[PDB]
Amino acid sequence: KLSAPLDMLKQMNESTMEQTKLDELRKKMSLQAEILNKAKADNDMFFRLLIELMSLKLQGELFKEQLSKISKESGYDSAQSALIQATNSEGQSPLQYALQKQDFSTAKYFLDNGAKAGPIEKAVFEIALDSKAAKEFGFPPLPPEKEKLHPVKNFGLVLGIKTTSVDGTPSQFGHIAPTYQLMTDSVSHFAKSHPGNKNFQEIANAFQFSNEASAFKFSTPQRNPEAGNDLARRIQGGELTTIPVSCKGHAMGLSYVPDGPGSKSGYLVYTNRGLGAKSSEHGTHIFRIEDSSKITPEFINNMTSGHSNGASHDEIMSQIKAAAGNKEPIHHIKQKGQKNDNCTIANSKSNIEGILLCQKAREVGGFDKLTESDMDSVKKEYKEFTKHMRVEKVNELAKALKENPQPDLNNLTKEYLKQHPNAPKLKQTLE
């Protein structure tokens, strides 16, 4: 009980593996399952039975026995073989699901039964460690050197690279502080390059205002009740306002587009292209607000603290819908799904395309008045913002690959030239 925090930290470290070695482990054990030829594995049944066991809140010896039972029920020859191979429909391993749910007891039982911690599982752990549930479990605050965005996350979350560093850092999971800073700086930079774009000077005032009022450290907002009084106040005044929004282990997108200054009506733009959304729903949903005043300081505070306070995906969504008046959205911008990422850049960024669309509907006098010429205008504006990100990241990469010609080398070669044939690419001179 007093030894569990340190014990579990040690076990994550003992069970750490590199992605390829864990993939060999999975392959090895899938070959092993063909020798016994038993019931083929059924992952969806394993997780169904898994999520039911965890709610019983049983203790170790009990849990290991039921874990074995439901493993064998699901076509796995052992609990260890389930924990190593099973993934759910969102692509989570059981360890990674336990940690994302901030369920540290069940995560340690998984560790006691052979679950392995690959990079993903460790980068979900690290997001999970900055939360109240982690504090009540006995975990310390996170080391302060984990506060700079790793080069592998900086270039990978923007360009689309899905690699890993030599130190084991994934390119795919990020804290809300460094990634919100980077979305904010990347919008001010675009506004400053296009100073007649009246849309993006307002988008930049919203991002600058909310990055300053939220005051995120790692993934916890620091100025806790005030940030919501301050964001609600800017919405009641009729200004564009991004609301940082999250739940346990996952970042969404949320902003408010006013009809105009002093006006009390407008639009709520929600974005989720990852965990929590049913595929058909991937992208951005626009709700018409006729009484902004359901967007309360308490709603705003709950949004910004969802991950920290342990809020589930469904708890946050119920709130976003009641602040929109329990009405259905009036539009859905279908956007690409994103798995194995908390979507700290992806859901922020795609939300901007629904801002543009609200600023175009606003200036046209409503969504029912948009022409198809307006949609292509919106998509061109958006795609011009994104192409500005990609170019400035590539130019950042090439230049940096060269203030140091020895992870940066992988970052360029890997995915950007190996999963992106669609693109003026810059070389890697050898020294």
Numbering used by the authors: 19 to 424, 426 to 442, 444 to 451
What text comes from the article?
A Legionella effector LegA15, also known as AnkD, is one of 11 ankyrin repeat–containing effectors in L. pneumophila. The Dot/Icm effector LegA15, a 471–amino acid protein encoded by gene lpg2456 of L. pneumophila Philadelphia, harbors an ankyrin repeat (ANK) domain that is known to mediate protein-protein interactions in eukaryotic cells. LegA15 is a GTPase with a unique catalytic mechanism, unlike any eukaryotic small GTPases. Here, we show that an ankyrin repeat containing effector LegA15 localizes directly in host lipid droplets (LDs), leading to Golgi apparatus fragmentation of the host cells by hijacking the host vesicular transport factor p115.
Here, with crystal structures of LegA15 and its binary complex with a guanosine triphosphate (GTP) analog, we showed that LegA15 is, in fact, a GTPase. To further understand the molecular mechanism of LegA15, we solved its crystal structure at a resolution of 2.59 Å. LegA15 contains an N-terminal ANK and a C-terminal domain (CTD). The CTD consists of a β-strand lobe sandwiched by two α-helical clusters. Isothermal titration calorimetry (ITC) experiment further confirmed that LegA15 bound both GTP and guanosine diphosphate (GDP) but not NAD+. GDPNP is shown to bind a positive-charged pocket formed by Arg291, Arg408, and Lys367 without inducing a large conformational change of LegA15 because LegA15 in this complex is well aligned to its ligand-free form [root mean square deviation (RMSD) of 1.0 Å]. We overexpressed two LegA15 fragments (amino acids 1 to 192 and 95 to 471) containing its ANK domain and C-terminal unknown domain, respectively, in HEK293T cells, and found that the ANK domain but not the C terminus was colocalized with the LDs. Together, these data suggested that LegA15 is directly associated with the host LDs through its ankyrin repeats.
